[PDB]
Amino acid sequence: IIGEDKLMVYVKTGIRIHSSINKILVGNEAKLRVVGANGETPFTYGT
Amino acid sequence: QQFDSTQYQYMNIIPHIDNPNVLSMTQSSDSQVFTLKGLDQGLVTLSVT
Amino acid sequence: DVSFVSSDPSIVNLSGREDLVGELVALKVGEATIKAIAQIVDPITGKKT
């Protein structure tokens, strides 16, 4: 053996909306996303 | 480990809010403490740098 | 969440499965309580409160 290392895999529920803003001016936009209800980001479920 | 309140006078503290029209903020007479106030019905996202 | 619970589903039932809908159906002559419960999910621990 020349090394050992340890990935923690969590397997976990449902969905929520996410945005860093919830106000918009007339004529402005905001990009919304889904995130999981534990915290599951589109990086790991979005595929 | 937390810093002691007496060291926060050395820090550049910057609060961040999305909707200040629903929830307002001021800093208090302690640099470590801020006073929030609700102004109208809604929901607001908050952080501090 | 808002979720609903009948004291006798055989006098008054909910038109669901997972019973978030608040729609109900009267099945017999009788008297019943429907308890509604409002609950927040903690987004950091998953705890319902």
Task: Fill in the DSSP letter of residue B6.
Answer: G
Phi, psi of B7 (to 5 degrees): -90, -15
The data reach a resolution, in angstroms, of 30.0
For residue C11, give how far its alpha carbon lies from the nearest alpha carbon of chain A (Å). 32
Q: How far is C-alpha B22 from the geometric centre of its chain's CA atoms?
A: 15
Query: Which two three-digit tokens encode residue C42?
Result: 């903690």
Angle, CA C4 vertex, CA C1 and CA C8 arms, to 5°: 165
Non-local (6+) Cβ contacts of C14 within 8 A are C4, C6, C21, C22, C23, C24, C25, C34
Cα of C31 to nearest chain A Cα, Å: 36
- What is the C-alpha to C-alpha distance for residues C40 and C49, in angstroms, rounded to an integer? 5
Contact (Cβ atoms closer than 8 angstroms) between residue C21 and residue C2: no
Chain C hits for A16, CB-CB cut-off 8 Å, are 43
Task: Indicate the residue type of B20.
Answer: P
Which residue is closest to A17 within chain C, CA to CA? C43
The sign of the dihedral angle between the CA atoms of B27, B30, B32, B38 is negative
Burial (CB < 10 A; 0-12, 13-18, 19+), residue C30, is exposed
Calpha distance B32→B3 (Å, rounded): 11
Determination approach: cryo-EM
